Design a protein around this ligand. Structure first.
Ligand SMILES: *[C@@H]1O[C@H](CO)[C@@H](O[C@@H]2O[C@H](CO)[C@@H](O[C@@H]3O[C@H](CO[C@H]4O[C@H](CO[C@H]5O[C@H](CO)[C@@H](O)[C@H](O)[C@@H]5O)[C@@H](O)[C@H](O[C@H]5O[C@H](CO)[C@@H](O)[C@H](O)[C@@H]5O)[C@@H]4O)[C@@H](O)[C@H](O[C@H]4O[C@H](CO)[C@@H](O)[C@H](O)[C@@H]4O[C@H]4O[C@H](CO)[C@@H](O)[C@H](O)[C@@H]4O)[C@@H]3O)[C@H](O)[C@H]2NC(C)=O)[C@H](O)[C@H]1NC(C)=O
Ligand SMILES: *[C@@H]1O[C@H](CO)[C@@H](O[C@@H]2O[C@H](CO)[C@@H](O)[C@H](O[C@@H]3O[C@H](CO[C@H]4O[C@H](CO[C@H]5O[C@H](CO)[C@@H](O)[C@H](O)[C@@H]5O)[C@@H](O)[C@H](O)[C@@H]4O[C@H]4O[C@H](CO)[C@@H](O)[C@H](O)[C@@H]4O)[C@@H](O)[C@H](O[C@H]4O[C@H](CO)[C@@H](O)[C@H](O)[C@@H]4O)[C@@H]3O)[C@H]2NC(C)=O)[C@H](O)[C@H]1NC(C)=O
Ligand SMILES: *[C@@H]1O[C@H](CO)[C@@H](O[C@@H]2O[C@H](CO)[C@@H](O[C@@H]3O[C@H](CO[C@H]4O[C@H](CO)[C@@H](O)[C@H](O)[C@@H]4O)[C@@H](O)[C@H](O[C@H]4O[C@H](CO)[C@@H](O)[C@H](O)[C@@H]4O[C@H]4O[C@H](CO)[C@@H](O)[C@H](O)[C@@H]4O)[C@@H]3O)[C@H](O)[C@H]2NC(C)=O)[C@H](O)[C@H]1NC(C)=O
Ligand SMILES: *[C@@H]1O[C@H](CO)[C@@H](O[C@@H]2O[C@H](CO)[C@@H](O[C@@H]3O[C@H](CO[C@H]4O[C@H](CO)[C@@H](O)[C@H](O)[C@@H]4O)[C@@H](O)[C@H](O[C@H]4O[C@H](CO)[C@@H](O)[C@H](O)[C@@H]4O)[C@@H]3O)[C@H](O)[C@H]2NC(C)=O)[C@H](O)[C@H]1NC(C)=O
Ligand SMILES: *[C@@H]1O[C@H](CO)[C@@H](O[C@@H]2O[C@H](CO)[C@@H](O[C@@H]3O[C@H](CO[C@H]4O[C@H](CO)[C@@H](O)[C@H](O)[C@@H]4O)[C@@H](O)[C@H](O)[C@@H]3O)[C@H](O)[C@H]2NC(C)=O)[C@H](O)[C@H]1NC(C)=O
Ligand SMILES: *[C@@H]1O[C@H](CO)[C@@H](O[C@@H]2O[C@H](CO)[C@@H](O[C@@H]3O[C@H](CO)[C@@H](O)[C@H](O)[C@@H]3O)[C@H](O)[C@H]2NC(C)=O)[C@H](O)[C@H]1NC(C)=O
Ligand SMILES: *[C@@H]1O[C@H](CO)[C@@H](O[C@@H]2O[C@H](CO)[C@@H](O[C@@H]3O[C@H](CO)[C@@H](O)[C@H](O)[C@@H]3O)[C@H](O)[C@H]2NC(C)=O)[C@H](O)[C@H]1NC(C)=O
Ligand SMILES: *[C@@H]1O[C@H](CO)[C@@H](O[C@@H]2O[C@H](CO)[C@@H](O[C@@H]3O[C@H](CO)[C@@H](O)[C@H](O)[C@@H]3O)[C@H](O)[C@H]2NC(C)=O)[C@H](O)[C@H]1NC(C)=O
Ligand SMILES: *[C@@H]1O[C@H](CO)[C@@H](O[C@@H]2O[C@H](CO)[C@@H](O)[C@H](O)[C@H]2NC(C)=O)[C@H](O)[C@H]1NC(C)=O
Ligand SMILES: *[C@@H]1O[C@H](CO)[C@@H](O)[C@H](O)[C@H]1NC(C)=O
Ligand SMILES: *[C@@H]1O[C@H](CO)[C@@H](O)[C@H](O)[C@H]1NC(C)=O
Ligand SMILES: *[C@@H]1O[C@H](CO)[C@@H](O)[C@H](O)[C@H]1NC(C)=O
Ligand SMILES: *[C@@H]1O[C@H](CO)[C@@H](O)[C@H](O)[C@H]1NC(C)=O
Lengths: 133, 456, 240, 211, 213, 231
């Protein structure tokens, strides 16, 4: 509200949904931001509890990677070319997140552990080891 | 030039799944008291302006027949009936034998309303009184004494509370936070295929839960030409859902000025029966403009003739169905009409054009009315519609109609189309042919050239 | 993977027009541009224009901005990430110097600084512009000749002579025989008619177990010739 | 079963209801009958009147249901006094064979009038048949009520006296007569005979004597 | 063409070679993007260097791209037998279209010689029936680029009806060519033998056919 | 434009077949409907039945066991006969031209319409008395003028002695004189028979050479009597 011109590009983000186009202005925002014993009272309660559960799962993964409050967090785990041969320009200028997910879906479960142990498990030890002195 | 993985929260990635949605209506009770049972007063009120995101460059397969949204909506309608009839009066003490007479009128050249008399236990158990009531002919069957009620041997009977209304109110189906509804926006969408244009919405549109047989009322109109939808049109056993662009206006009435008679049958269980009729005696009917139904059937025969090269032969209707399936059953003003759709499907066309039609006469269909119904082919509790005081009048737009292609022996029998619902759920598939439920997976990893600040 | 198949070679008189097709598959037709590149012997390769199948935007070179009409058809989905498309290009007021091969090319990247770049190319649509008329070819059988006396190999084939349209197709046993076949480029006679040859090397002992038939198809004349090569030779090195 | 009465002022507007009220859409007819004369149809369709029926009469049509069928007459004169019948044809009933109950309309309020009496003696040919009857006529009297008293000489007769119940004529007045059977010897023996017609306040008398 | 490339260039087997691509300010190198295409004669070209230095997908790291403010360069390292063909550069931007250059033909030196294969065919009997006679001399499988053909009638030069094709490249990195000699049956019958003489820079192969056989 | 005339016996012996006839002069009998309505004294009008233009009968259910209606095609007349009459069947009979009307209260295809008849033309009406008793003819006596009032206005008349039935027609000079005529209603004498008379008021200037002769016509007694009235 009350934001014209100087703020209107603020609504038009850029580098976020830059992997091709299988999205729109609020394809990201339609999920992140859109939040009596009858059948509608029971079905709604299971829908609210499911929403909370699915939210805390993602944020927990983010927490156990060192990425809790972050949207774009970098990591110290290198990219193994066994997962992808392509370059940064073949990925971000030629594919959409929908089909990039479909490709790396094989190694996706593996990288999740690598994010957990190879860094934020090590970082929190290294940072505690070196803050002894 | 190195490559490190980088996590991204909020990526436009979705997978197809099924979840438990919830209702969403518009108005409540203090503006319209005791307004609905189909779309109850309890579900979340819809937001003032809906948010619809049209998804460019997106192409995804839909399927109206394998969609689980019609399965959930079907079981929501069924279960919403039990919770409403549960506390209301059961008509168990009303299967005593019935001494029935016919209605008194002059000689003609039979009757539809009848007049039955029976004795029932008063509110006091030991004492008994004899009462009279007028039950429609399709509610009594013979067994010295004439009739009994129809549903006795089959199952129990429960009278719906007169406070509730059987009005279809637009109800929305909304997916929970974390899921999404993808909506096909193509002007002529195949039954089950890829949609070139997709949108996403948190909720569906105003889907009036109109229970109807053979004809679809108050539905959604396609905006260009008409659409024929079948899971397999070469397969005769697959139902055919049709959709129109210009809906045909229908008009129906029950002219008899009935009355409401309250017969006490138990403690605080006042049963309501049709009292004596007032004024003229005449049956219920439905008017359909002949000029509009001819053009509509003219538009339907065109698309049918494009799917079949030899132009076949035009169809008739209504084989194999004794009660609810053959008639065009639909609610109006509270009573359940059962129309005879023979004036509509008695035609024959060839090379388009016309035949079997002769001005501007309203097409009239003699519609019989019942009060005992067991809906959705459900074995068990059957509802007794209470009588409606005064004269009944309604009107509706017919947007679609269900047909069924018939096949004769092996070959060369030539084919017609008997209208008939292959299942109850086919009414909902006409409104959920475009919506699909999907879940969002917003966590995406991808390689960039950034490395997190080194251990320090 | 993604593939592009153009129309066949055509012949048109100077003054008329031609419309070449380019039917794509394997990829989302709307995601990438479609370029049109021709190569004439007088000026080498020359870029004509591109069109955006998605939007409909087109960019024509100044040397083709008055005589080229590019269009595309709407994509037909195959899966959620592929489709089949069709792009067309129409050149008007053909001249003799327009003679050459014409290519359609798929774009390179969806977004960036070189999106439209010609990446996946078509197989070629040779367009000849002349005042003469189409002439069908005359096929003659080539007698077997000795290739290696100690190795026991020979060589036989067919001969195409005096045909004006440039495209030429030679197949053996309706495509059954593909190993050992060698087809040579055409020669430009002083009269303006082309001629070439096609030969296949086969063992000398294969005379009574294999049948060798060449299938020459000259589509601009709509003539199919099926000649049976006589396996009886007259070379002294092969008779031994 | 029989006929019912009704009293209406002269020149004012009248309202004749109808028995057996309608159950559905009604088609009522209204017949105007006079005893001994032919009935005349005023209204066939509930609002329609055939040619010759004056505009004074009017029926209530059943445009909206619940109305009750009433025949209304304006400017009631003596010529309107007659039996009225209401034929009831509604959709719920069958074939209404019997006509409605007659409504005996009576009118009141008129100017004064005096009758004219003409008593005549028995003729000569009557006396030849060994009989003799006196004949006393009464014409144009004000109200039906009238009492005829005979007088043989100055004494009343009281025997063999027969008088008419007054009935209305074409001139909207009533007419009546009175007879007195006698023997030829009783007619000749008396000096004179007197027929005294007492009407309302006044009393007229005619006297005739033998020759 | 305003975009000028080197006319020709050559390098040894396993050595490296460099192609130049430059032109006027309308096609200058400072502000325009330069792409490179390996365009064999007759076949569809193949992108190798999409921006100034980023190579196309699936391109060996042997191809390098460099561009100065005054000339763009393509460098082929560890040369192969298949790297001997025509190459073109394209000058463009994000919205404009390609501008192809003059072209460069790379030669691969430090090679293994290949003995040519010659085959001569006499005209068939069906051709002689139509009063036509054409000699067919085919050459293939020779690595040296050029070949010269000289026809002889009874060991005497022939200068009428001699049509020789340009040397093409074989799928096995070799080369091939063909030469035809149209004759009349009077000249074909009144001679003892005809000869197809193919001459290379290291050896001259001769094949002879006789009308008597 | 339609005139009806009733003709009948007038007297019927009990337990016999009363007959009557209704002659039509307006139009065709196969073009209209016809119905009979009798009028007994002291009771209301009674509908006994009707006949259609296609000639198929149906009668009032009370009298249906004894009434028969038939129409003649050659002669524009309507016949009505009554079997086993009593003294109740004693009545003034009316033949009337009925009209069929259709009152529709819904859709025509599903019935929802009833027919209703109305008689818009009525005949003069004939009287029929049923009794075993015989006829008695009337005798006419002249009424000499009072040799009456000032202005030379005299009043004469002609008397009709006791007659058996009330049906009586009286005319003056074969109907030539119509001004001043005033026939009085019949008085039921204790002898069981009625007796009326007529009067005429004429000027005294024409009271001498008037030659007035009143004509008394009576149908049940079959007698027509003329009488001269002179001072
Ligand atoms: C669905 O389809 C069905 C089937 O088509 C439709 O059914 C229709 O239902 C209605 C219900 O009202 C029926 O209405 C009835 O129509 C009759 C006939 O009216 C027509 O004829 C009139 C003249 O014709 C008469 O006279 C001729 C001789 O002159 C005779 O030969 C005839 O037989 C007739 O007796 C004419 O005047 C009418 O015009 C009026 O109506 C038309 C169309 O309705 C209008 O366009 C006009 O402007 C004008 O208004 C018409 O052409 C009517 O007479 C009936 O009306 C009376 O009866 C009602 C019963 O309660 C009463 O309430 C009304 O007030 C009305 O009363 C009038 O008439 C009485 C005397 O007759 C008076 O007493 C009264 O005071 C008043 O004057 C009645 O309306 C239709 O017949 C029927 N249609 C068909 C074709 O069957 C149905 O409507 C459709 N729609 C739906 C949603 O259901
Ligand atoms: C669905 O998928 C589609 C893929 O098929 C998407 O299309 C792609 O959209 C991307 C996002 O915009 C583009 O990045 C991508 O390629 C771009 O191409 C641009 C050149 O074309 C643009 O500008 C042209 C300028 O017009 C003038 O100049 C040309 C010169 O040839 C001339 O012919 C014209 O007549 C005119 O005079 C224009 O031709 C193009 O149409 C286009 O945009 C214009 O037109 C559209 C539609 O009419 C209009 O809406 C716009 O407002 C413009 O007016 C390059 O310039 C661009 O690179 C620049 O920008 C990027 C920013 O990312 C920057 O990184 C570069 O350095 C450079 O500055 C880029 O290369 C495009 N590809 C194709 C082939 O369509 C589509 O967007 C997608 N939809 C959704 C929902 O996302
Ligand atoms: C953005 O993303 C899209 C798709 O996600 C991507 O498009 C695809 O690019 C790839 C690039 O390779 C195209 O795939 C094929 O690549 C092979 C490479 O050949 C070598 O490598 C293979 C595999 O190692 C070996 O098997 C092979 O022997 C080679 O060593 C090409 O050979 C294919 O090219 C065809 O066309 C060529 C034209 O030059 C021919 O030379 C070749 O023979 C192929 O012929 C095809 O078509 C012929 C005509 O009908 C037919 O005769 C053949 O049998 C064959 O079918 C091909 O290029 C792939 O096609 C692209 N499309 C899709 C939908 O995947 C973009 O590249 C990417 N953008 C960027 C910048 O990354
Ligand atoms: C499929 O079903 C539909 C709906 O039922 C049929 O449509 C009806 O068809 C019937 C005939 O089968 C039509 O009925 C006919 O009505 C005519 C009336 O029109 C005249 O009269 C009206 C006023 O009442 C005027 O407005 C009009 O201008 C005409 O002057 C009758 O004349 C016809 O009479 C025939 O039938 C009767 C009764 O059987 C006989 O007595 C006659 O001799 C004659 O044979 C007839 O009654 C009806 O009108 C149509 N309805 C509509 C909505 O228009 C289709 O015909 C049917 N198709 C099939 C079976 O193939
Ligand atoms: C309307 O809906 C129809 C389905 O009810 C669409 O039918 C299409 O018909 C074609 C006929 O060629 C099918 O192709 C068959 O594919 C199967 C295997 O399926 C797999 O491969 C196809 C390749 O097209 C792919 O689309 C599928 O997703 C599977 O991966 C083969 O075994 C057959 O031989 C045949 O090739 C299509 O599968 C089918 N649906 C499509 C196109 O998705 C019809 O196209 C629709 N029409 C319109 C106008 O929408
Ligand atoms: C792809 O689907 C979208 C969504 O339907 C289509 O865009 C729609 O086009 C209609 C055409 O009139 C627009 O109409 C609008 O209606 C709204 C009321 O809902 C009104 O407020 C607007 O003023 C306008 O009249 C509408 O903008 C648009 N849909 C939306 C989001 O409103 C589109 O046509 C489909 N395909 C393509 C590519 O056209
Ligand atoms: C079923 O019932 C509906 C509604 O009761 C009927 O709709 C009616 O359609 C006619 C079409 O002419 C409307 O007439 C309109 O009149 C207005 C006012 O003069 C005029 O401006 C329009 O141009 C038009 O002529 C009529 O109003 C409308 N009735 C309504 C809205 O109440 C329909 O005819 C019935 N169809 C059947 C029996 O099949
Ligand atoms: C349909 O049937 C209903 C009856 O179920 C009819 O309603 C009745 O209408 C009459 C008027 O003719 C009502 O009489 C009214 O009573 C109220 C007080 O109750 C009084 O204020 C009025 O002055 C009048 O006397 C009667 O009460 C009412 N009966 C009810 C409502 O139960 C109706 O007229 C019929 N309609 C048609 C078109 O058939
Ligand atoms: C449509 O109408 C035709 C009219 O004949 C029906 O055909 C009859 O169908 C019955 C039941 O199968 C057969 O026993 C008869 O033999 C058929 N007709 C004749 C005369 O042979 C047909 O069944 C109807 N079908 C629909 C669509 O209701
Ligand atoms: C993904 O994993 C599944 C496991 O069954 C395997 O079959 C499939 O080939 C893999 N796909 C890719 C693209 O790696
Ligand atoms: C119920 O009773 C009716 C009437 O006797 C009979 O027709 C019907 O078959 C019975 N149904 C069952 C399931 O008993
Ligand atoms: C439709 O039915 C036919 C005949 O049974 C069958 O061959 C075909 O596979 C079916 N197609 C679909 C889409 O179900
Ligand atoms: C129905 O439509 C057809 C084709 O337009 C026409 O021939 C026919 O007359 C129409 N029938 C009616 C009753 O309007």
């Amino acid at each position: 509200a009350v934001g014209l011109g100087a703020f209107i590009l603020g609504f038009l983000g850029a580098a976020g949904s830059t992997m091709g186009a299988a999205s729109m202005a609020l394809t990201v925002q339609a999920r992140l931001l859109l939040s009596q014993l009858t059948v509608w009272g029971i079905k709604q309660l299971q829908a609210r509890v499911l929403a909370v559960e699915r939210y805390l799962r993602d944020q927990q993964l983010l927490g156990i990677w060192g990425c809790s409050g972050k949207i774009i967090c970098c990591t110290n785990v290198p990219w193994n070319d066994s997962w992808s041969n392509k370059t940064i320009n073949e990925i971000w200028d030629n594919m959409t997140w929908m089909q990039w997910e479909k490709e790396i879906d094989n190694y996706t479960q593996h990288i999740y552990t690598l994010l957990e142990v190879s860094q934020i498990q090590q970082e929190k030890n290294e940072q505690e080891l070196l803050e002894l002195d | 030039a190195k490559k490190w993985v980088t996590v991204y929260y909020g990526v436009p990635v979705w997978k197809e799944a099924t979840t438990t949605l919830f209702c969403a209506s518009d108005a409540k009770a203090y503006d319209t008291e005791v307004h609905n049972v189909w779309a109850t007063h309890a579900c979340v009120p819809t937001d003032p302006n809906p948010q619809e995101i049209v998804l460019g460059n997106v192409t995804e397969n839909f399927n109206m027949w394998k969609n689980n949204m019609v399965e959930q909506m079907h079981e929501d309608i069924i279960s919403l009936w039990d919770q409403s009839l549960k506390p209301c009066v059961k008509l168990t003490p009303l299967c005593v034998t019935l001494n029935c007479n016919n209605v008194n009128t002059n000689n003609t050249n039979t009757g539809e309303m009848k007049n039955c008399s029976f004795n029932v236990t008063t509110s006091i158990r030991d004492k008994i009184k004899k009462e009279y009531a007028l039950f429609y002919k399709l509610d009594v069957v013979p067994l010295i004494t004439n009739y009994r009620l129809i549903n006795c041997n089959t199952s129990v009977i429960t009278q719906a509370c007169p406070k509730v209304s059987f009005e279809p109110i637009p109800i929305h189906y909304c997916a929970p936070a974390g899921f999404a509804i993808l909506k096909c926006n193509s002007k002529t969408f195949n039954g089950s295929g890829p949609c070139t244009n997709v949108s996403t919405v948190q909720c569906t549109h105003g889907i009036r839960p109109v229970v109807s047989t053979q004809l679809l009322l108050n539905g959604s109109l396609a905006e260009e030409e008409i659409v024929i939808r079948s899971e397999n049109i070469t397969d005769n056993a697959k139902t055919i859902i049709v959709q129109l662009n210009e809906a045909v206006e229908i008009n129906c009435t029950r002219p008899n000025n009935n009355t409401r008679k309250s017969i006490h049958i138990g403690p605080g269980r006042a049963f309501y029966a049709t009292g004596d009729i007032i004024g003229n005696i005449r049956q219920a009917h439905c008017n359909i403009s002949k000029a509009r139904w001819n053009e509509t059937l003219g538009q339907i025969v065109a698309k049918l003739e494009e799917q079949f090269p030899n132009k076949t032969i035009i169809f008739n209707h209504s084989s194999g169905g004794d009660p609810e399936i053959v008639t065009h059953s639909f609610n109006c003003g509270g009573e359940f009409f059962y129309c005879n759709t023979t004036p509509l499907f008695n035609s024959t066309w060839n090379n388009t054009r016309t035949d079997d039609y002769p001005g501007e006469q309203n097409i009239t269909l003699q519609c019989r009315i019942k009060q005992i119904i067991n809906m959705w082919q459900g074995v068990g509790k059957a509802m007794y519609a209470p009588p409606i005081r005064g004269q009944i009048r309604c009107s509706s737009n017919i947007t679609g109609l269900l047909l069924t292609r018939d096949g004769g022996r092996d070959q060369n029998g030539t084919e017609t189309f008997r209208p008939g619902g292959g299942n109850m759920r086919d009414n909902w598939r006409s409104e959920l042919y475009k919506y699909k439920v999907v879940k969002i997976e917003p966590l995406g990893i991808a390689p960039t050239a950034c490395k997190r600040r080194v251990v320090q | 993977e993604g593939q592009l198949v153009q129309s066949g070679a055509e012949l048109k008189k100077p003054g008329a027009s031609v419309k070449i097709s380019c039917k794509t598959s394997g990829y989302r037709f709307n995601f990438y541009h479609i370029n049109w590149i021709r190569q004439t012997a007088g000026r080498g390769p020359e870029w004509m224009g591109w069109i955006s199948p998605y939007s409909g935007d087109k960019n024509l070179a100044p040397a083709f901005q008055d005589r080229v009409i590019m269009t595309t058809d709407t994509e037909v989905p195959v899966t959620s990430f592929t489709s089949t498309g069709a792009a067309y290009m129409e050149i008007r007021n053909l001249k003799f110097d327009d003679t050459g091969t014409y290519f359609c090319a798929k774009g390179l990247l969806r977004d960036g600084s070189s999106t439209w770049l010609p990446y996946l190319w078509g197989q070629g649509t040779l367009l000849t512009v002349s005042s003469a008329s189409t002439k069908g070819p005359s096929v003659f059988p080539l007698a077997p000749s000795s290739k290696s006396t100690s190795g026991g190999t020979a060589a036989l084939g067919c001969l195409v002579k005096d045909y004006f349209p440039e495209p030429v197709t030679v197949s053996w046993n309706s495509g059954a025989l593909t190993s050992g076949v060698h087809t040579f480029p055409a020669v430009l006679q002083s009269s303006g008619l082309y001629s070439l040859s096609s030969v296949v090397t086969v063992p000398s002992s294969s005379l009574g177990t294999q049948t060798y038939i060449c299938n020459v198809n000259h589509k601009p004349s709509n003539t199919k010739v099926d000649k049976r090569v006589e396996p009886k030779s007259c070379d002294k090195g092969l008779e031994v | 079963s029989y006929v019912s009465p009704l009293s209406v002022a002269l020149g004012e507007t009248a309202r004749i209801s109808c028995g057996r009220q309608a159950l559905g859409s009604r088609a009522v007819q209204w017949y105007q009958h006079k005893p001994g004369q032919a009935p005349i149809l005023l209204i066939y369709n509930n609002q329609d009147r055939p040619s010759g029926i004056p505009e004074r009469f009017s029926g209530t049509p059943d445009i909206n249901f619940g109305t009750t069928a009433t025949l209304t007459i304006s400017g009631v004169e003596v010529g309107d006094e007659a039996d009225y019948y209401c034929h009831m044809w509604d959709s719920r009933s069958g074939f209404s064979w019997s006509f409605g109950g007659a409504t005996r309309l009576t009118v009141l309020s008129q100017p004064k009038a005096a009758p004219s009496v003409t008593l005549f003696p028995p003729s000569s040919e009557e006396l030849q048949a060994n009989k003799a009857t006196l004949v006393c006529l009464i014409s144009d009297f004000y109200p039906g009520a009238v009492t005829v008293a005979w007088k043989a000489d100055s004494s009343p007769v009281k025997a063999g006296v027969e008088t008419t119940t007054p009935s209305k004529q074409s001139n909207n007045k009533y007419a009546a007569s009175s007879y007195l059977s006698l023997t030829p010897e009783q007619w000749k023996s008396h000096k004179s005979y007197s027929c005294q017609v007492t009407h309302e306040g006044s009393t007229v008398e005619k006297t005739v004597a033998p020759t | 063409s305003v975009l000028t490339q080197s006319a020709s260039v050559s390098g040894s087997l396993g050595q490296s070679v460099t192609i130049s691509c430059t032109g006027p300010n309308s096609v200058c190198c400072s502000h325009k993007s330069i792409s490179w295409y390996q365009w064999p004669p007759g076949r569809a070209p193949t992108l190798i260097i999409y921006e100034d230095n980023e190579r196309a997908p699936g391109i060996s790291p042997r191809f390098s791209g460099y561009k100065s403010y005054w000339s763009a360069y393509l460098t082929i390292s560890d040369l192969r037998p298949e790297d001997e063909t025509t190459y073109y550069c394209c000058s463009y931007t994000h919205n404009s279209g390609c501008v192809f250059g003059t072209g460069t033909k790379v030669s691969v030196l430090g090679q293994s010689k290949a003995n040519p294969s010659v085959t001569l065919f006499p005209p068939s009997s069906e051709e002689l029936q139509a009063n036509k006679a054409t000699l067919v001399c085919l050459i293939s499988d020779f690595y040296p680029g050029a070949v010269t053909v000289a026809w002889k009638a009874d060991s005497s030069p022939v200068k009428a009806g001699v049509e020789t094709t340009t040397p093409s490249k074989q799928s096995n990195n070799k080369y091939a060519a063909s030469s035809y000699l149209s004759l009349t049956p009077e000249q074909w019958k009144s001679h003892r033998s005809y000869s197809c003489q193919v001459t290379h820079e290291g050896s001259t192969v001769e094949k002879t056919v006789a009308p008597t056989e | 434009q339609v005139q009806l005339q009733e003709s009948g016996p007038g007297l019927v012996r009990p337990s016999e077949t009363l007959s009557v006839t209704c002659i039509v002069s307006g139009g065709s009998i196969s073009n209209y409907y016809w119905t009979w309505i009798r009028q007994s004294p002291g009771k209301g009008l009674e509908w006994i039945g009707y006949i259609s233009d296609r000639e198929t009968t149906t009668y009032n259910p009370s009298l249906n066991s004894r009434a028969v209606i038939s129409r003649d095609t050659s002669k524009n007349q309507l016949s009505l006969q009554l079997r086993s009459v009593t003294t109740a069947d004693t009545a003034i009979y009316f033949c009337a031209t009925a009209r069929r009307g259709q009152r529709i209260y819904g859709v025509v295809s599903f019935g929802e319409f009833f027919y209703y008849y109305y008689m818009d033309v009525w005949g003069k009406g004939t009287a029929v008395t049923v009794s075993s008793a015989s006829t008695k003819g009337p005798s006419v006596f002249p009424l000499a003028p009072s040799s009456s009032t000032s202005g030379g206005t005299a009043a004469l008349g002609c008397l009709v002695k006791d007659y058996f039935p009330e049906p009586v027609t009286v005319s003056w000079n074969s109907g030539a004189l119509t001004s001043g005529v005033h026939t009085f209603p019949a008085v039921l004498q204790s002898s069981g028979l009625y007796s009326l008379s007529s009067v005429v008021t004429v000027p005294s200037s024409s009271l001498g050479t008037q030659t007035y002769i009143c004509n008394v016509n009576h149908k049940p007694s079959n007698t027509k009597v003329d009488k001269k009235v002179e001072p």
